[PDB]
Amino acid sequence: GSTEYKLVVVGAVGVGKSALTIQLIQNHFVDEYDPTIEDSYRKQVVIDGETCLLDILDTAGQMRDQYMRTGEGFLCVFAINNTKSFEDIHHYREQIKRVKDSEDVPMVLVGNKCDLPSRTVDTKQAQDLARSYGIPFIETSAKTRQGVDDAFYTLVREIRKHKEKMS
Ligand SMILES: Nc1nc2c(ncn2[C@@H]2O[C@H](COP(=O)(O)OP(=O)(O)NP(=O)(O)O)[C@@H](O)[C@H]2O)c(=O)[nH]1
Ligand SMILES: [Mg+2]
């Protein structure tokens, strides 16, 4: 078996967690909203010449300790027209560090819905927060597929760097 990576997608209700994950796995988008309880998915990919098995947990917007314990890296999603969702990232991250007992947990900040018109969260404020945390920031649109593969592949790169360092 090729290296397995356990990725967990977290963020507020309605930000696009499910829409990003379904683009990655099935290559389509839907407008209809079906709220998530707890979903999981598996996908084989090649990243930087290496075959990876991605094991993805797609979490509910509104159980937390257990997924924080199992995940190796976290996709922290907000929507660019949802100020509260952006503010919520601080609270997710604190809960993660506390569960892992560690200042260093692989994470990627994702600002989704970049296809929409009136953004209430600006790029600079998100870039600033990612610089503070020492993690990457990626803008995405699950509607168009812009950035989707980059978001997940970057998270795997962050997990690889963390194993190297911990060694
Ligand atoms: N314009 C646009 N709409 C999107 C985008 N991503 C998701 N949406 C829309 O936003 C709504 C919520 O998407 P969804 O994937 O269900 O969000 P979620 O974060 O999984 N919700 P939950 O926490 O309840 O499981 C749907 O109407 C969906 O089509 C996007 O990038 N752009
Ligand atoms: Mg969902």
Structure tokens, 155? 């998270």
**Using CA positions, which residue lies closest to atom 14 of ligand 1?**
16
Ligand 2 mean position, distance from CA 164 (Å): 32
Three-state SS at 62: coil
Q: Where are the domains of the chain?
A: 1-167
* Distance from Cα 3 to the centre of ligand 1, integer Å: 30
* Residue of 54, 93, 98, 71 whose CA lies nearest to 8: 71
Beta pairing class for 50-59 and 3-10: parallel
Contact present, 111 and 140 (Cβ < 8 Å): yes
Which of 8, 23, 36 should be mutated for ligand 1, with most atoms under 8 A from CB? 36
Rounded Cα gap, residues 68 and 64, in angstroms: 6
State how far the Cα of 92 lies from the Cα of 45, in Å rounded to an integer.
28
The one-letter amino acid at 157: R
Q: By C-alpha distance, which of 143, 153, 136, 135 is closest to 112?
A: 143
Cα 31 to ligand 2 centre (Å): 12
Q: Show the tokens assigned to 109.
A: 């900040």
Given resolution (angstroms): 1.6
Q: What is the dihedral of CA 142, 2, 41, 102, to 10 degrees?
A: -80
Domain 1-167 carries which CATH code? 3.40.50.300
Task: Find the 49 Cα to ligand 2 centroid distance in Å.
Answer: 31
CA atoms within 13 A of residue 52's CA, in its CB half-sphere: 20
- Give the residue carrying structure tokens 């209430």: 120
For strands 73-79 and 50-59, give the pairing: unpaired
Tokens for 99?
Answer: 């569960």
Structure tokens at 59: 């979490």
Which-ligand-closest: CA of 33? 1
